[PDB]
C-alpha cells in the first residue's frame, strides 16, 4: 500500500517532469524547461535542481500537490531515487539536492504547531549570529575487527548509530567499531539562529528566536541583518535541559511480558522544535 503509494507518488512525479514543462508559445519559451534544467546543469555540473511549485500545482489539479505538502519527511528517498533514474536515462559521483520555490503561503513563528511537522510552511525573519562551516558525515564505514571491516552503511539519519546488526562477517550484532575516517562522502553546513520580525510582534511580547541549519549548497547564502524566505520543511531536535519543567515525562520502558525468564536500561525523551531548509531567497 504505502510501498506502492509513495512509489506511485514517485512514478507520477517521474511522469510529471518527463512531460512538457511550459505551455507558452514561440513568443517565450516553448517546451522542455525541466529537460533543459539537467542539460544546462550538464554544462556546469553543480548537481542540484531548481524546480517550481507552481507548475506542480497545474497538472494533477492539486491532488498531488496535496499529497506532498503534508508528509515530506515520509517522502525523502522516493523523490530522490526516481530522479536518479531520470538522470541516467539522459545523462551520466552523482549526489543530489532538491530545492523548491514559490510557496503561495508564508507564516510566522507564532503560526507553527507540532501538527505542522513534516509539512511545508514558509517563515521569514531576522538573521542573527551566523556560525562557521563544519562537516557532516552521513556515510559510516564502521565494522569490527572481524574480516569484513568495509561496511559503508547507516547513520545517514540524525543518530550516531554506525553498526548494522546482521553482517556476514565473523562479527556479531553486538560487535561494533569506529568509522573509517577516509572513505566516505560528506557535506558541510553552517548554523544561524534567526530572530522574528519586529513588524509582527504583538503587545507585551518580545521577538523570538529559532535555530536553522543550511546544509550543502545553501551555506554562505545567509547574511546577518537580512530578510529571507525559506524552504517549507521542518524538523525536530532532541533537547536536554527541559527537566523539572514540569510535566508528565514520557519514557521508553520496553516490554518484559515476552520471553520467559528464570536490568533497567530504559530511557526518556524531551525534544524541541527546530527548523531545516534548503532554499533561501533573500528578498527583503
Amino acid at each position: 500500500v504505502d510501498d506502492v503509494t509513495g512509489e506511485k507518488v514517485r512514478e507520477a512525479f517521474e511522469q510529471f517532469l518527463e512531460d512538457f514543462s511550459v505551455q507558452s508559445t514561440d513568443t517565450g519559451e516553448v517546451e522542455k524547461v525541466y529537460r533543459a534544467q539537467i542539460e544546462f546543469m550538464k554544462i556546469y555540473d553543480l548537481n542540484t535542481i531548481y524546480i517550481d511549485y507552481q507548475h506542480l500545482s497545474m497538472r494533477e489539479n492539486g491532488a498531488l500537490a496535496m499529497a506532498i505538502s503534508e508528509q515530506y519527511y515520509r517522502f525523502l528517498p522516493f523523490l530522490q531515487k526516481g530522479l536518479r533514474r531520470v538522470v541516467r536515462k539522459y545523462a551520466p559521483e552523482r549526489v543530489f539536492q532538491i530545492s523548491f520555490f514559490n510557496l503561495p503561503t508564508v507564516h510566522r513563528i507564532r503560526d507553527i504547531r507540532s501538527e505542522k511537522i513534516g509539512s511545508l510552511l514558509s517563515i521569514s525573519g531576522t538573521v542573527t549570529r551566523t556560525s562557521e562551516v563544519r562537516p557532516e558525515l552521513y556515510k559510516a564505514s564502521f565494522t569490527c575487527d572481524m574480516c569484513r571491516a568495509i561496511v559503508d552503511n547507516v547513520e545517514q539519519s540524525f543518530k550516531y548509530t554506525e553498526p548494522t546488526f546482521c553482517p556476514n562477517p565473523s562479527c556479531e550484532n553486538r560487535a561494533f567499531w569506529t568509522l573509517n575516517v577516509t572513505r566516505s562522502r560528506f557535506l558541510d553546513w553552517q548554523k544561524v539562529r534567526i530572530q522574528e520580525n519586529a513588524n509582527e510582534i504583538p503587545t507585551g511580547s518580545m521577538p523570538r528566536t529559532l535555530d536553522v541549519i543550511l546544509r550543502g549548497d545553501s551555506v554562505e547564502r545567509a547574511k546577518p541583518g537580512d530578510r529571507c524566505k525559506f524552504t517549507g520543511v521542518e524538523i525536530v531536535v532532541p533537547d536536554v535541559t527541559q527537566l523539572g519543567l514540569p510535566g508528565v515525562k514520557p519514557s521508553s520502558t520496553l516490554d518484559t511480558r515476552g520471553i520467559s525468564k528464570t536490568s533497567l536500561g530504559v530511557r526518556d525523551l524531551t525534544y524541541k522544535i527546530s527548523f531545516l531548509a534548503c532554499h533561501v531567497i533573500s528578498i527583503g
Partner: protein, 96 residues
C-alpha cells in the same frame, strides 16, 4: 639523521572561508593574520617503555601522527600486558 622539507610556490591561493570536504588530506596555500598563540610544549618523537614485570626496557618506537603507541606484550613471553613510558631515554619534539 632526519630532514623534513618545505614547498615554495603553490600557484593557487585560497585565503579563507572556502574549505570543503574536497579540501581535506590535501595541500592548501593559505594566507592570514597572526592571532594569539601559546607557549612551546614537548611532544614525544621516540618512545621507549619499560616492563615492570620483566625487568628492563622495551625499546624505541616511532611517534605516529596524533595517536599513541601502546605496545601490548613482548619480551616477557608476550604476556603480562602492563607497561609505562619511562622518563629518560625518550627523545622529544617541541610542539606549539
Amino acid at each position: 639523521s632526519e630532514i623534513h622539507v618545505r614547498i615554495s610556490d603553490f600557484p593557487t591561493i585560497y585565503s579563507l572561508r572556502e574549505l570543503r570536504e574536497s579540501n581535506l588530506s590535501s595541500l592548501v596555500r593559505v594566507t592570514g593574520v597572526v592571532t594569539r598563540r601559546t607557549g612551546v610544549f614537548p611532544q614525544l618523537k621516540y618512545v621507549k617503555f619499560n616492563c615492570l614485570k620483566c625487568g628492563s626496557i622495551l625499546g624505541p618506537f616511532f611517534q605516529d601522527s596524533n595517536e599513541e603507541i601502546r605496545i601490548s606484550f613482548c619480551t616477557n613471553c608476550k604476556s603480562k600486558g602492563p607497561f609505562r613510558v619511562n622518563g629518560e631515554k625518550t627523545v622529544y619534539r617541541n610542539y606549539q
